[PDB]
């Protein structure tokens, strides 16, 4: 019987994908986690002492400048301090920015979706958290992360040459993708005819003329967001083995 045989193949493929999805999800979980912890450690220090001299020196420390493109403090009175330094656009107010509002609404450390950077006019992701002293919020600390860097991490693996990984929100918004044109599109825009369901274990869909298999894995330990790790696999290549 070819039905039983196809059934045996598919079940094996789905077990492999589950394994790859789990461990890739852990990786990005751990990597994002360290960044979050670092921003948190930085805010808890500023909480105790946020004099101008201290703020400057703290933000210039190598553990920060080598991890984030920019690290910064926006204060509740609107005063902004960043390292390394940058030309400043007229009218800037850190309290109006997505990283600031997101941290405040979260009541603690969180991550933004991509938003348009103030200087590069390109997409950026920020790890951010409020500065908490005596139950009060003195401002928000943020550390900037490049989309390209997140891509590289979730695509360490091949995956045996079958496909690639991307990040997508529970709402269906593509956050990070090896193909730049797909970023911040929705799953419905990319797949209008038969849209992959995030809840559903394994979905088939058609992309650039080829049948693909998609599978979604929750990413744990991201406060106040719901992000999935997605695997997108070439069906014909996978089954061929």
Ligand X SMILES: N[C@@H](Cc1c[nH]c2ccccc12)C(=O)O
Which CB atom, from 30 or from 120, has the smaller least distance to ligand X?
Answer: 120
Number of residues that bind ligand X (CB under 6 A): 12
Which CB atom, from 42 or from 217, has the smaller least distance to ligand X?
Answer: 42
Q: Are 171 and 162 in contact (CB under 8 A)?
A: no
Taking CA atoms, 59 is separated from 117, 145, 162, in Å, by: 19, 16, 42
Give dist(CA 162, CA 158) in Å, integer.
7
Go through the chain and tell me how many residues it has. Answer: 241
Q: Are 146 and 164 in contact (CB under 8 A)?
A: no
Give dist(CA 233, CA 214) in Å, integer.
6
Torsion over CA of 54, 59, 61 and 65, rounded to 10 degrees?
A: -170
Give dist(CA 166, CA 159) in Å, integer.
13
3-class SS of residue 53: helix
Q: Which of 92, 188, 204, 223 binds ligand X (CB under 6 A)?
A: 92
Sketch the per residue contact string, 142 through 181, with ligand X: x for CB under 6 A, - otherwise.
Answer: --x-------------------------------------
119 binds ligand X (CB under 6 A): yes
Q: Which of 83, 97, 177, 212 binds ligand X (CB under 6 A)?
A: 97
113 binds ligand X (CB under 6 A): no
Stretch of residues binding ligand X (CB under 6 A), selected from 36-44, 59-67, 84-92, 101-109:
84-92
Q: What angle do CA 199, 211, 236 make, to 5 degrees?
A: 115
Stretch of residues binding ligand X (CB under 6 A), selected from 11-19, 116-124, 154-162, 223-231:
116-124
Tell the smallest beta-carbon distance from residue 97 to ligand X (Å).
4
79 binds ligand X (CB under 6 A): no
Q: Which of 23, 79, 88, 105 binds ligand X (CB under 6 A)?
A: 88
Site residues for ligand X per CB under 6 A: 70, 72, 86, 88, 92, 97, 117-119, 124, 126, 144
């Amino acid at each position: 019987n070819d039905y039983l045989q196809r059934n045996a193949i598919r079940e094996d493929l789905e077990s492999y994908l589950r394994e790859m999805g789990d461990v890739t999800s852990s990786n990005i979980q751990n990597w994002l986690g360290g960044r979050l912890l670092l921003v948190e450690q930085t805010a808890q220090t500023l909480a105790r002492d946020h004099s101008p001299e201290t703020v400057s020196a703290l933000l210039e420390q190598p553990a920060l400048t080598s991890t984030f493109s920019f690290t910064y403090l926006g204060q509740q009175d609107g005063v902004f301090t960043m390292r390394p330094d940058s030309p400043m656009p007229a009218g800037y107010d850190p309290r109006s920015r997505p990283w600031y509002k997101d941290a405040v609404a979260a009541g603690g450390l969180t991550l933004t979706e991509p938003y348009v950077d103030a200087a590069t006019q390109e997409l950026i992701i920020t790890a951010a958290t409020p500065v908490k002293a005596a139950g009060n919020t003195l401002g928000v600390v943020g550390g900037d992360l490049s989309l390209k860097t997140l891509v590289q991490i979730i695509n360490s693996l091949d995956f045996s040459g079958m496909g690639y990984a991307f990040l997508v929100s529970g709402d269906g918004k593509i956050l990070v993708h090896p193909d730049k044109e797909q970023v911040m599109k929705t799953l419905s825009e990319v797949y209008p005819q038969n849209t992959p369901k995030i809840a559903t274990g394994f979905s088939e869909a058609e992309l650039h003329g080829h049948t693909r298999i998609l599978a979604f894995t929750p990413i744990k330990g991201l406060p106040s967001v719901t992000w999935y790790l997605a695997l997108s696999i070439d069906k014909d290549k996978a089954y061929a083995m």
